[PDB]
Coordinates of C-alpha atoms in Angstrom, one line a residue:
Chain A
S1 CA 36.1 -6.5 1.3
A2 CA 33.9 -4.5 3.7
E3 CA 34.4 -5.0 7.4
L4 CA 31.8 -6.6 9.7
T5 CA 29.2 -4.0 10.7
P6 CA 28.0 -3.4 14.3
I7 CA 24.4 -2.5 14.0
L8 CA 23.6 -2.5 17.7
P9 CA 26.0 -3.5 20.5
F10 CA 24.5 -7.1 20.3
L11 CA 23.8 -7.3 16.5
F12 CA 26.4 -7.5 13.7
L13 CA 25.8 -7.7 9.9
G14 CA 28.4 -9.3 7.8
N15 CA 29.5 -11.6 5.0
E16 CA 30.7 -15.2 4.7
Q17 CA 34.3 -14.2 5.6
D18 CA 33.1 -12.5 8.8
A19 CA 31.3 -15.8 9.7
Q20 CA 34.7 -17.6 9.7
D21 CA 36.6 -15.1 11.8
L22 CA 36.4 -17.0 15.1
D23 CA 38.7 -14.6 17.0
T24 CA 36.6 -11.5 16.1
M25 CA 33.3 -13.2 17.0
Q26 CA 34.7 -14.1 20.4
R27 CA 36.1 -10.6 20.9
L28 CA 32.7 -9.2 20.2
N29 CA 31.0 -11.6 22.6
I30 CA 29.0 -13.1 19.7
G31 CA 27.2 -16.3 20.8
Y32 CA 24.6 -16.6 18.0
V33 CA 24.9 -16.8 14.3
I34 CA 22.2 -16.5 11.6
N35 CA 23.1 -17.9 8.2
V36 CA 20.7 -16.6 5.5
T37 CA 21.6 -19.0 2.7
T38 CA 20.6 -22.4 1.6
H39 CA 24.0 -23.6 0.7
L40 CA 26.8 -22.1 2.8
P41 CA 28.2 -24.2 5.7
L42 CA 27.5 -23.1 9.3
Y43 CA 31.2 -22.1 9.8
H44 CA 32.7 -23.5 13.0
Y45 CA 29.6 -25.6 13.8
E46 CA 31.7 -28.5 15.1
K47 CA 33.5 -26.4 17.8
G48 CA 30.1 -26.1 19.5
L49 CA 30.9 -22.5 20.4
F50 CA 27.8 -20.8 18.9
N51 CA 24.1 -21.2 18.6
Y52 CA 23.1 -21.3 14.9
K53 CA 20.0 -20.7 12.8
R54 CA 19.8 -21.2 9.0
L55 CA 17.2 -19.2 7.1
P56 CA 17.6 -21.2 3.8
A57 CA 16.7 -18.4 1.4
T58 CA 18.0 -17.5 -2.1
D59 CA 18.6 -13.9 -3.2
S60 CA 16.1 -14.2 -6.0
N61 CA 13.0 -12.2 -7.1
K62 CA 10.6 -14.9 -5.9
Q63 CA 12.2 -15.6 -2.5
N64 CA 10.0 -15.0 0.5
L65 CA 12.0 -13.5 3.3
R66 CA 9.1 -12.2 5.4
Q67 CA 8.3 -15.8 6.4
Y68 CA 11.6 -15.9 8.3
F69 CA 11.3 -12.5 10.0
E70 CA 9.6 -13.7 13.2
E71 CA 12.0 -16.6 13.7
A72 CA 15.0 -14.4 13.2
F73 CA 13.7 -11.7 15.6
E74 CA 13.1 -14.3 18.3
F75 CA 16.7 -15.5 17.9
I76 CA 18.2 -12.0 18.0
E77 CA 16.1 -11.4 21.1
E78 CA 17.4 -14.7 22.7
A79 CA 20.9 -13.4 22.2
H80 CA 20.0 -10.0 23.5
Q81 CA 18.3 -11.1 26.7
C82 CA 21.2 -13.4 27.7
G83 CA 23.8 -10.7 27.1
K84 CA 25.4 -12.2 24.0
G85 CA 25.8 -10.8 20.5
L86 CA 24.5 -12.2 17.2
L87 CA 26.1 -12.2 13.8
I88 CA 23.8 -12.4 10.8
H89 CA 25.3 -12.9 7.4
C90 CA 24.7 -14.1 3.9
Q91 CA 27.3 -14.1 1.2
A92 CA 28.2 -10.5 0.9
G93 CA 26.1 -8.9 3.6
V94 CA 24.3 -6.9 0.9
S95 CA 20.8 -8.2 0.3
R96 CA 19.3 -11.2 2.2
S97 CA 20.9 -10.5 5.6
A98 CA 20.5 -6.7 5.3
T99 CA 16.8 -7.1 4.7
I100 CA 16.4 -9.2 7.9
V101 CA 18.3 -6.5 9.9
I102 CA 16.3 -3.7 8.5
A103 CA 13.1 -5.5 9.4
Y104 CA 14.4 -6.2 12.9
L105 CA 15.0 -2.5 13.4
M106 CA 11.5 -1.7 12.0
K107 CA 9.8 -3.9 14.5
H108 CA 12.0 -3.6 17.6
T109 CA 13.3 -0.1 17.4
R110 CA 10.1 1.2 15.6
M111 CA 12.0 2.9 12.8
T112 CA 10.2 3.6 9.6
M113 CA 11.4 1.5 6.7
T114 CA 13.2 4.5 5.3
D115 CA 14.9 5.3 8.6
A116 CA 15.9 1.7 9.3
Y117 CA 17.3 1.5 5.7
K118 CA 19.3 4.7 6.1
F119 CA 20.5 3.5 9.6
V120 CA 21.9 0.3 8.2
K121 CA 23.2 1.9 5.0
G122 CA 24.9 4.6 7.0
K123 CA 26.8 1.9 8.9
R124 CA 27.3 -0.5 6.0
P125 CA 27.3 1.5 2.7
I126 CA 27.4 -1.6 0.5
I127 CA 23.9 -2.8 1.4
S128 CA 21.4 -3.0 -1.4
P129 CA 18.4 -5.4 -0.9
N130 CA 16.8 -6.5 -4.2
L131 CA 13.5 -4.9 -5.2
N132 CA 11.6 -8.1 -4.2
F133 CA 12.9 -7.7 -0.7
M134 CA 12.3 -4.0 -0.7
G135 CA 8.7 -4.7 -1.6
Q136 CA 8.4 -7.1 1.3
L137 CA 9.9 -4.5 3.6
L138 CA 7.2 -2.0 2.5
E139 CA 4.4 -4.5 3.1
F140 CA 6.0 -5.3 6.5
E141 CA 5.8 -1.6 7.3
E142 CA 2.1 -1.5 6.4
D143 CA 1.5 -4.5 8.6
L144 CA 3.4 -3.0 11.5
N145 CA 1.6 0.3 11.2
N146 CA -1.8 -1.4 11.3
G147 CA -0.8 -3.9 14.0
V148 CA -0.9 -6.9 11.7
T149 CA 1.9 -9.4 12.6
Chain B
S1 CA 33.8 8.6 -23.5
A2 CA 30.1 8.1 -22.9
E3 CA 26.9 9.3 -24.6
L4 CA 23.1 9.2 -24.1
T5 CA 21.5 5.8 -23.9
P6 CA 18.8 4.3 -26.2
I7 CA 15.9 2.8 -24.2
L8 CA 13.3 2.6 -27.0
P9 CA 13.6 3.8 -30.6
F10 CA 12.2 7.2 -29.5
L11 CA 13.4 7.3 -25.8
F12 CA 16.9 8.0 -24.6
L13 CA 18.4 8.4 -21.1
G14 CA 21.4 10.4 -20.2
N15 CA 23.3 12.6 -17.7
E16 CA 24.5 16.2 -17.6
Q17 CA 27.4 15.6 -19.9
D18 CA 25.4 13.4 -22.3
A19 CA 22.8 16.3 -22.7
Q20 CA 25.5 18.5 -24.2
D21 CA 26.3 16.3 -27.2
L22 CA 24.5 18.2 -29.9
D23 CA 26.0 15.9 -32.6
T24 CA 24.7 12.7 -31.0
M25 CA 21.2 14.3 -30.5
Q26 CA 20.8 15.2 -34.2
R27 CA 22.1 11.9 -35.5
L28 CA 19.7 9.9 -33.2
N29 CA 16.8 12.2 -34.4
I30 CA 16.1 13.5 -30.9
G31 CA 13.6 16.4 -31.2
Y32 CA 12.5 16.6 -27.6
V33 CA 14.2 17.1 -24.2
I34 CA 13.1 16.5 -20.6
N35 CA 15.5 18.1 -18.1
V36 CA 14.7 16.7 -14.7
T37 CA 16.4 19.4 -12.6
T38 CA 15.6 22.8 -11.3
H39 CA 19.1 24.2 -11.8
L40 CA 20.7 23.0 -15.0
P41 CA 20.5 25.0 -18.2
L42 CA 18.4 23.9 -21.1
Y43 CA 21.3 22.8 -23.3
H44 CA 21.2 24.1 -26.9
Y45 CA 18.2 26.2 -26.1
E46 CA 19.4 29.3 -28.0
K47 CA 19.8 27.2 -31.2
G48 CA 16.1 26.6 -31.3
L49 CA 16.4 23.0 -32.4
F50 CA 14.4 21.2 -29.7
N51 CA 11.2 21.2 -27.7
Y52 CA 11.9 21.3 -24.0
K53 CA 10.1 20.5 -20.8
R54 CA 11.7 21.1 -17.4
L55 CA 10.6 19.0 -14.4
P56 CA 12.1 21.1 -11.6
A57 CA 13.1 18.4 -9.2
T58 CA 15.9 17.9 -6.8
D59 CA 17.6 14.6 -5.8
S60 CA 16.4 15.1 -2.2
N61 CA 14.8 13.1 0.5
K62 CA 11.2 14.2 -0.2
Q63 CA 11.2 15.1 -3.8
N64 CA 8.0 13.9 -5.4
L65 CA 8.5 12.7 -9.0
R66 CA 5.3 10.7 -9.3
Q67 CA 3.5 14.1 -9.7
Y68 CA 5.3 14.6 -13.0
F69 CA 4.8 11.1 -14.5
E70 CA 1.6 11.9 -16.4
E71 CA 3.1 15.1 -17.8
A72 CA 6.4 13.3 -18.9
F73 CA 4.4 10.5 -20.5
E74 CA 2.4 12.9 -22.6
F75 CA 5.5 14.6 -23.9
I76 CA 7.2 11.3 -24.7
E77 CA 4.1 10.3 -26.6
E78 CA 3.9 13.6 -28.5
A79 CA 7.5 12.9 -29.6
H80 CA 6.7 9.3 -30.4
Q81 CA 3.7 10.3 -32.5
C82 CA 5.8 12.9 -34.3
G83 CA 8.5 10.3 -35.3
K84 CA 11.2 12.1 -33.2
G85 CA 13.3 10.9 -30.3
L86 CA 13.1 12.3 -26.7
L87 CA 16.0 12.5 -24.4
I88 CA 15.4 12.6 -20.6
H89 CA 18.4 13.6 -18.5
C90 CA 19.3 14.9 -15.1
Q91 CA 22.8 14.6 -13.6
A92 CA 25.5 12.0 -12.9
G93 CA 23.9 8.8 -11.7
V94 CA 20.7 9.5 -13.7
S95 CA 18.6 8.8 -10.7
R96 CA 15.7 11.2 -11.4
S97 CA 15.6 10.6 -15.2
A98 CA 15.9 6.9 -14.8
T99 CA 13.0 6.9 -12.4
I100 CA 10.8 8.6 -15.0
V101 CA 11.9 6.1 -17.8
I102 CA 11.2 3.1 -15.6
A103 CA 7.8 4.6 -14.8
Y104 CA 7.0 5.0 -18.5
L105 CA 8.1 1.4 -19.2
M106 CA 5.9 0.2 -16.4
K107 CA 2.8 2.1 -17.5
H108 CA 3.2 1.9 -21.3
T109 CA 5.0 -1.4 -21.9
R110 CA 3.6 -3.1 -18.8
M111 CA 6.8 -4.4 -17.3
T112 CA 7.0 -5.1 -13.6
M113 CA 9.2 -2.7 -11.7
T114 CA 12.0 -5.2 -11.4
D115 CA 11.9 -6.0 -15.1
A116 CA 11.8 -2.3 -16.2
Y117 CA 14.7 -1.6 -13.8
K118 CA 16.7 -4.5 -15.2
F119 CA 15.8 -3.4 -18.7
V120 CA 17.2 0.1 -18.1
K121 CA 20.2 -0.9 -16.0
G122 CA 21.2 -3.5 -18.7
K123 CA 21.4 -0.5 -21.0
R124 CA 22.7 2.0 -18.5
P125 CA 24.6 0.1 -15.7
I126 CA 25.3 3.1 -13.4
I127 CA 22.0 4.0 -11.7
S128 CA 22.6 5.8 -8.4
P129 CA 20.3 4.4 -5.7
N130 CA 17.6 6.7 -4.3
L131 CA 15.4 5.0 -1.8
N132 CA 12.7 7.7 -2.1
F133 CA 12.3 7.3 -5.8
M134 CA 12.4 3.5 -5.4
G135 CA 9.5 3.8 -3.0
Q136 CA 7.5 5.9 -5.5
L137 CA 8.0 3.3 -8.2
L138 CA 7.0 0.5 -5.9
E139 CA 3.8 2.4 -5.0
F140 CA 3.2 3.2 -8.7
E141 CA 3.6 -0.5 -9.5
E142 CA 1.1 -1.4 -6.8
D143 CA -1.3 1.2 -8.3
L144 CA -0.9 -0.1 -11.8
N145 CA -1.3 -3.7 -10.6
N146 CA -4.5 -2.8 -8.8
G147 CA -5.8 -0.9 -11.8
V148 CA -5.9 2.4 -10.1
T149 CA -6.5 5.3 -12.5
Chain C
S1 CA -2.0 -9.1 -10.7
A2 CA -4.2 -7.2 -8.3
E3 CA -3.7 -7.6 -4.6
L4 CA -6.2 -9.2 -2.3
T5 CA -8.8 -6.6 -1.2
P6 CA -10.1 -6.0 2.3
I7 CA -13.7 -5.0 2.0
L8 CA -14.5 -5.1 5.7
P9 CA -12.1 -6.1 8.5
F10 CA -13.5 -9.7 8.3
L11 CA -14.3 -9.9 4.6
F12 CA -11.7 -10.1 1.7
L13 CA -12.3 -10.2 -2.0
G14 CA -9.7 -12.0 -4.1
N15 CA -8.5 -14.2 -7.0
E16 CA -7.3 -17.8 -7.3
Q17 CA -3.8 -16.8 -6.4
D18 CA -4.9 -15.1 -3.2
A19 CA -6.7 -18.3 -2.2
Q20 CA -3.4 -20.2 -2.3
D21 CA -1.5 -17.7 -0.1
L22 CA -1.7 -19.6 3.1
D23 CA 0.6 -17.1 5.0
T24 CA -1.4 -14.1 4.1
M25 CA -4.7 -15.8 5.0
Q26 CA -3.4 -16.7 8.5
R27 CA -1.9 -13.2 9.0
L28 CA -5.4 -11.8 8.2
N29 CA -7.1 -14.2 10.6
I30 CA -9.1 -15.7 7.8
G31 CA -10.9 -18.9 8.9
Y32 CA -13.4 -19.2 6.1
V33 CA -13.2 -19.4 2.3
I34 CA -15.9 -19.1 -0.3
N35 CA -14.9 -20.4 -3.8
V36 CA -17.4 -19.2 -6.4
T37 CA -16.4 -21.5 -9.2
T38 CA -17.5 -25.0 -10.3
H39 CA -14.0 -26.2 -11.3
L40 CA -11.3 -24.7 -9.1
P41 CA -9.9 -26.7 -6.2
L42 CA -10.5 -25.7 -2.7
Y43 CA -6.9 -24.7 -2.1
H44 CA -5.4 -26.1 1.1
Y45 CA -8.5 -28.2 1.8
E46 CA -6.3 -31.0 3.1
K47 CA -4.5 -29.0 5.8
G48 CA -7.9 -28.7 7.6
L49 CA -7.2 -25.1 8.5
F50 CA -10.2 -23.3 6.9
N51 CA -14.0 -23.8 6.6
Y52 CA -15.0 -23.9 3.0
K53 CA -18.0 -23.3 0.8
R54 CA -18.3 -23.8 -2.9
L55 CA -20.8 -21.8 -4.9
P56 CA -20.5 -23.7 -8.1
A57 CA -21.4 -21.0 -10.6
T58 CA -20.0 -20.1 -14.0
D59 CA -19.4 -16.5 -15.2
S60 CA -22.0 -16.8 -18.0
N61 CA -25.0 -14.8 -19.1
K62 CA -27.4 -17.5 -17.9
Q63 CA -25.8 -18.2 -14.5
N64 CA -28.1 -17.6 -11.5
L65 CA -26.1 -16.1 -8.6
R66 CA -29.0 -14.8 -6.6
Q67 CA -29.8 -18.5 -5.6
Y68 CA -26.5 -18.5 -3.6
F69 CA -26.8 -15.1 -1.9
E70 CA -28.5 -16.3 1.3
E71 CA -26.0 -19.2 1.8
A72 CA -23.0 -16.9 1.2
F73 CA -24.3 -14.3 3.6
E74 CA -24.9 -16.9 6.3
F75 CA -21.3 -18.1 5.9
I76 CA -19.9 -14.6 6.0
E77 CA -21.9 -14.0 9.2
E78 CA -20.7 -17.3 10.7
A79 CA -17.1 -16.0 10.2
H80 CA -18.1 -12.6 11.5
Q81 CA -19.8 -13.7 14.7
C82 CA -16.9 -16.0 15.8
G83 CA -14.3 -13.3 15.2
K84 CA -12.7 -14.7 12.1
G85 CA -12.3 -13.4 8.6
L86 CA -13.6 -14.8 5.3
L87 CA -11.9 -14.8 1.9
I88 CA -14.3 -15.0 -1.2
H89 CA -12.8 -15.5 -4.6
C90 CA -13.4 -16.7 -8.1
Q91 CA -10.7 -16.8 -10.8
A92 CA -9.9 -13.1 -11.1
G93 CA -12.0 -11.5 -8.3
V94 CA -13.7 -9.5 -11.1
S95 CA -17.3 -10.9 -11.6
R96 CA -18.8 -13.7 -9.7
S97 CA -17.2 -13.1 -6.4
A98 CA -17.6 -9.3 -6.6
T99 CA -21.3 -9.7 -7.2
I100 CA -21.6 -11.7 -4.0
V101 CA -19.7 -9.1 -2.0
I102 CA -21.8 -6.3 -3.5
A103 CA -25.0 -8.1 -2.6
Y104 CA -23.7 -8.8 1.0
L105 CA -23.1 -5.1 1.4
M106 CA -26.6 -4.3 0.1
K107 CA -28.3 -6.5 2.5
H108 CA -26.1 -6.2 5.6
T109 CA -24.8 -2.6 5.4
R110 CA -27.9 -1.4 3.7
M111 CA -26.0 0.3 0.8
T112 CA -27.9 1.0 -2.4
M113 CA -26.7 -1.1 -5.3
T114 CA -24.9 1.9 -6.7
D115 CA -23.2 2.7 -3.4
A116 CA -22.1 -0.9 -2.7
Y117 CA -20.7 -1.1 -6.3
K118 CA -18.7 2.1 -5.8
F119 CA -17.6 0.9 -2.4
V120 CA -16.1 -2.3 -3.8
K121 CA -14.8 -0.7 -7.0
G122 CA -13.1 2.0 -5.0
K123 CA -11.2 -0.7 -3.0
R124 CA -10.7 -3.1 -6.0
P125 CA -10.8 -1.1 -9.2
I126 CA -10.7 -4.2 -11.5
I127 CA -14.2 -5.4 -10.6
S128 CA -16.7 -5.6 -13.4
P129 CA -19.7 -8.0 -12.9
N130 CA -21.2 -9.0 -16.1
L131 CA -24.5 -7.5 -17.2
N132 CA -26.5 -10.7 -16.2
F133 CA -25.2 -10.3 -12.6
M134 CA -25.8 -6.6 -12.7
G135 CA -29.4 -7.3 -13.6
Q136 CA -29.6 -9.7 -10.7
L137 CA -28.2 -7.1 -8.3
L138 CA -30.9 -4.6 -9.4
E139 CA -33.7 -7.1 -8.8
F140 CA -32.1 -7.9 -5.4
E141 CA -32.2 -4.2 -4.6
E142 CA -35.9 -4.1 -5.5
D143 CA -36.6 -7.1 -3.3
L144 CA -34.7 -5.6 -0.4
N145 CA -36.5 -2.3 -0.7
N146 CA -39.9 -4.0 -0.7
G147 CA -38.9 -6.5 2.0
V148 CA -39.0 -9.5 -0.3
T149 CA -36.2 -12.0 0.6
Chain D
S1 CA 0.2 7.3 4.9
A2 CA 1.0 11.0 5.5
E3 CA -2.4 12.3 4.5
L4 CA -6.1 12.0 5.0
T5 CA -7.9 8.7 5.1
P6 CA -10.6 7.2 2.8
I7 CA -13.5 5.7 4.8
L8 CA -16.1 5.5 2.0
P9 CA -15.8 6.8 -1.6
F10 CA -17.2 10.1 -0.4
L11 CA -16.0 10.3 3.2
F12 CA -12.5 10.9 4.4
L13 CA -11.0 11.3 7.9
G14 CA -8.0 13.3 8.9
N15 CA -6.2 15.5 11.3
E16 CA -4.9 19.1 11.4
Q17 CA -2.0 18.4 9.1
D18 CA -4.1 16.3 6.7
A19 CA -6.6 19.2 6.3
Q20 CA -3.9 21.4 4.9
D21 CA -3.1 19.2 1.9
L22 CA -4.9 21.1 -0.9
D23 CA -3.5 18.8 -3.6
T24 CA -4.8 15.6 -2.0
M25 CA -8.2 17.2 -1.5
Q26 CA -8.7 18.1 -5.1
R27 CA -7.3 14.8 -6.4
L28 CA -9.7 12.8 -4.2
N29 CA -12.6 15.1 -5.4
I30 CA -13.3 16.4 -1.9
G31 CA -15.8 19.3 -2.2
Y32 CA -16.9 19.5 1.4
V33 CA -15.2 19.9 4.8
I34 CA -16.3 19.4 8.4
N35 CA -14.0 21.0 10.9
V36 CA -14.7 19.7 14.4
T37 CA -12.9 22.3 16.5
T38 CA -13.8 25.7 17.7
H39 CA -10.3 27.1 17.2
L40 CA -8.7 25.9 14.0
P41 CA -8.9 27.9 10.8
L42 CA -11.0 26.8 7.9
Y43 CA -8.1 25.7 5.8
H44 CA -8.2 27.0 2.2
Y45 CA -11.2 29.1 2.9
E46 CA -10.0 32.2 1.0
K47 CA -9.6 30.0 -2.2
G48 CA -13.3 29.5 -2.3
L49 CA -13.0 25.9 -3.4
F50 CA -15.0 24.1 -0.7
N51 CA -18.2 24.1 1.3
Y52 CA -17.5 24.2 5.0
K53 CA -19.2 23.4 8.3
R54 CA -17.7 24.0 11.6
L55 CA -18.8 21.9 14.6
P56 CA -17.3 24.0 17.4
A57 CA -16.3 21.3 19.8
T58 CA -13.5 20.8 22.2
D59 CA -11.9 17.4 23.1
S60 CA -13.0 17.8 26.7
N61 CA -14.7 16.1 29.6
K62 CA -18.2 17.1 28.9
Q63 CA -18.2 18.0 25.2
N64 CA -21.4 16.8 23.6
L65 CA -20.9 15.5 20.1
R66 CA -24.1 13.6 19.8
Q67 CA -25.8 17.0 19.3
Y68 CA -24.0 17.5 16.0
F69 CA -24.6 14.0 14.5
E70 CA -27.8 14.8 12.5
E71 CA -26.3 18.0 11.2
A72 CA -23.0 16.2 10.1
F73 CA -25.0 13.4 8.5
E74 CA -27.1 15.8 6.4
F75 CA -23.9 17.5 5.2
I76 CA -22.2 14.2 4.3
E77 CA -25.3 13.2 2.5
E78 CA -25.4 16.5 0.5
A79 CA -21.9 15.8 -0.6
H80 CA -22.7 12.2 -1.4
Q81 CA -25.7 13.2 -3.4
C82 CA -23.6 15.8 -5.3
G83 CA -20.9 13.3 -6.3
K84 CA -18.3 15.0 -4.2
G85 CA -16.1 13.9 -1.3
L86 CA -16.3 15.2 2.3
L87 CA -13.3 15.4 4.6
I88 CA -14.0 15.5 8.4
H89 CA -11.0 16.6 10.5
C90 CA -10.1 17.8 13.9
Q91 CA -6.6 17.5 15.4
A92 CA -3.9 14.9 16.1
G93 CA -5.5 11.7 17.4
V94 CA -8.7 12.4 15.3
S95 CA -10.9 11.7 18.4
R96 CA -13.7 14.1 17.6
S97 CA -13.8 13.5 13.9
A98 CA -13.5 9.8 14.2
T99 CA -16.5 9.8 16.7
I100 CA -18.6 11.4 14.0
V101 CA -17.4 9.1 11.3
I102 CA -18.2 6.0 13.5
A103 CA -21.6 7.5 14.2
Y104 CA -22.4 7.9 10.5
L105 CA -21.3 4.3 9.8
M106 CA -23.5 3.0 12.6
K107 CA -26.6 5.0 11.5
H108 CA -26.2 4.8 7.7
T109 CA -24.4 1.5 7.1
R110 CA -25.8 -0.1 10.3
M111 CA -22.6 -1.4 11.6
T112 CA -22.4 -2.2 15.4
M113 CA -20.2 0.2 17.3
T114 CA -17.4 -2.3 17.6
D115 CA -17.5 -3.1 13.9
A116 CA -17.6 0.6 12.9
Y117 CA -14.7 1.3 15.2
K118 CA -12.7 -1.6 13.8
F119 CA -13.6 -0.5 10.3
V120 CA -12.2 3.0 10.9
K121 CA -9.2 2.0 13.0
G122 CA -8.3 -0.6 10.3
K123 CA -7.9 2.4 7.9
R124 CA -6.7 4.8 10.6
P125 CA -4.8 3.0 13.3
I126 CA -4.2 6.0 15.6
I127 CA -7.5 7.0 17.3
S128 CA -6.8 8.8 20.6
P129 CA -9.1 7.3 23.3
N130 CA -11.8 9.6 24.7
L131 CA -14.0 7.9 27.3
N132 CA -16.7 10.6 27.0
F133 CA -17.2 10.2 23.2
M134 CA -17.0 6.4 23.6
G135 CA -19.9 6.7 26.0
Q136 CA -21.9 8.8 23.6
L137 CA -21.4 6.3 20.8
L138 CA -22.4 3.4 23.1
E139 CA -25.7 5.3 24.0
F140 CA -26.2 6.1 20.3
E141 CA -25.8 2.4 19.5
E142 CA -28.4 1.5 22.2
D143 CA -30.8 4.1 20.7
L144 CA -30.3 2.8 17.2
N145 CA -30.7 -0.9 18.4
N146 CA -34.0 0.1 20.2
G147 CA -35.3 1.9 17.2
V148 CA -35.3 5.4 18.8
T149 CA -35.9 8.2 16.3

């Protein structure tokens, strides 16, 4: 399967198997995990080693991900400001979780949607957010451009 | 091997190799060809069997295909009205030709983008991603949904 | 369906679906809703988040909309003077609600009836007030021109 | 967007780059151009497609733009009456051209300065600050509020 992807030094995009790799996460100084699924466990919750957030979304055509953008960015920024890394994952690292990372890059590194997509896809070539999510990323771009978030 | 792909009784999608299958073209009653590249030959041109239109695109970062939509739709319709089939092809991955097919299904059979995409990909499972064309289709969808002329 | 239409920075024209989209309304800083129907609910009334006004009109050939113009304008102006936006809707955003917006623009931005129509239609191409309403907009123009309101 | 900006059905605002987009101009039915610089070319002049007016300003300390308002309004109106669009452009930041657009909205659609500014910036989020033009618009607002001719 595809390896865990460093996006920034403190932000890693991955799949459910990555979220179980305790040794890798501790090597990378990860202290925060975002699980972008309704149904997966928070792996290693009971060892109390990470701070977790669930964004309980499906990968469907009606799922609203935009509603979770602000919360996710705040959590990435919490990890960032205290010098820890954050792992964000869904099942494959292809769609839900990639959409959140692209959006983070749009807001916080001011990349266009196209540039943030290519930035992530260059690092993790299997990403492919569904068209619903792609439409949300375009509306998010509009709203960022007009100062509307 | 493979061959060109039925989309509607009068509309077929294919790649570079598929366009060279003169036997399949005649059996499927294809009378019209759209070649969505600047550099490929008009296959079978010298035989004088078909009506051609070249849309001289590239599969590049800034290629505008929306500009050709109205012209391609008119030519599909002229074949439709004549009782002949039209093949639209580009190259391996069918990214440019699929973009125009999806557009035609969105405008003329009123499918949403996601539904037209799924309709085409169900028939033609390999569609190379192109973020630029995907964005032109999402904008074309917004325009159709808003009733823009 | 057509997307919600910003007419002015504090005035949005929409359909019944738009009036349910709580997240969009709060993003747009909407604090006021006008519902131009007799029979639809005031969506989200029970969350006590918006100020509402019902203009309980039908889309018929006998319906008097002029009688509601002054009330609607006062409400739009309440929203405007306190720095909030207003969403006005009927079922489709096509006829009743569009007529009210066109009339607001005639009185408060001094647009002719033709110019206010084209202004709204340019932003929301699906609008089409019925001929009864169009006749009322013309007599409203007369009364504005003569100072008779 | 990467092109000129609709303000009213017949009035568009843009920069140096936007003025060079001959396809966008024709598609939007722009027949008229106001170039608010002393030094830029009249783009597309040799094609004989458009009616031009140069307002030979600079974006400087003491540049008076108020002096051109009446002339620019007459030209906008001539286009409006003709059924054609008018593009007004200057350079990156659109400070001079936006000043004239805001002036026209204040005089002809009677928006307050702040509301006209917000209307334009909502459509065109980058407006370079110019304290001198802002002061001219504030004095023009006072004149209009006092009924000065």
